[model samples]
Target: KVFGRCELAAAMKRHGLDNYRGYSLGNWVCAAKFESNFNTQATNRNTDGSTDYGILQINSRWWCNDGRTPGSRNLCNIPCSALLSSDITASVNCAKKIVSDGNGMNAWVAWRNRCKGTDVQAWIRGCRL
Candidate 1:
């Protein structure tokens, strides 16, 4: 499922991402834009032999277990495929753990590279929050 900006914002908020760990809804929305463009089924394989899965692109190296990542920690206790589902609950939950893991939103490179310190209101411009 590919979500529009508003829809993604609403979904993230519903999953408790709005202001979760001091990051705004726009931050999550903006991160998703660069990570996977709101596509639930998106996946990217890293050169380090781990794969990133789903909207927020949770990495297999330290988060979800893909069985292929050499030293997966499975910190989220979920299969990587779960993140690729149309229902984004697992992805959102795992993202919470990622952000709360002490790195904040900087856990995601996309967030650091584009969303960090940027005015992300445009990411959810017309959303009726």
Candidate 2:
């Protein structure tokens, strides 16, 4: 499970995303770094039969209400397979939208302040980039 920085960068570009400070990737990396150190194939078992999968740690049971097949609850709604698709950029782009209306860097900063780092919720007040 490589970090796939190149894939992430390409995904950002494909989505016409100029940055990642305020998008899903923003918080996603923080979570990913903490959860599995960026392992794309990472998975975890929940109390239910469903499992959390992929880099963003998306839950199959939650997203895939129906099943794992295409057009099912999971595939139709969130489409976790996109994360493992050949076009890796698509996955990050989707996550970016989920994070901050297609913004990544800014979203990441928000995640860092609110979710990742210290209790300084307003930490971004003094930071740039």
Candidate 3:
């Protein structure tokens, strides 16, 4: 499912992402927009033979067990397939785990490049929150 900006905010906040680890819901919405355009089924494969899955594009290399990424640690301890669900709860959970690993939102390069130092409020500006 593809979500509108406010829709994503509502869903993510419902999943405990609001102010998670000092990162605001706006920050997460900004990153998710850049990462997957709010599409739950989004995916990308790196030249390194690893794939990124779901809304936040969690990587197969370290966070998810795709069974295809060589030497995957599966730190989130969930299948990469789980991240693709339109429900997004699993992806949100994994994202929390990723942030908790000391990378915060920087775990996603797209977030670092686009949302890290930007005025993230624009991502959720019209949302009621």
- Predictions: Cα RMSD each: 0.8, 7.1, 0.9
Model 1, range 2-84, lDDT digits (tens) per residue?
A: 98889989988988998898888899999999999999999999999999999999999999898889977999999999999
By summed lDDT, which 10 consecutive residues of candidate 3 come out lowest? 101-110
Question: Which is better, 1 or 2, measured by TM-score?
Answer: 1
Worst 10 residues of 2 by lDDT: 120-129
Candidate 3 regions off by >4 Å? none
- Is candidate 1 or 3 superior in TM-score? 1
Q: How many residue pairs clash per model?
A: 0, 17, 0
State residue 65's C-alpha deviation in candidate 2, in Å. 6.9
**Model 3, 10-115: lDDT tens per residue?**
9999999989999989999998998999999998998999999988999999989988899888988899999999888889999988999877888899999889
lDDT of 1: 0.91
The TM-score values for the models, in the order shown, are: 0.97, 0.49, 0.95
Off by over 4 Å in 2: 4-26, 65-72, 75-81, 85-87, 93-114, 117-129
Which rank order by TM-score, best down to worst?
1, 3, 2
**TM-score for model 1?**
0.97
Roughly what TM-score does model 3 have, to 2 decimal places?
0.95
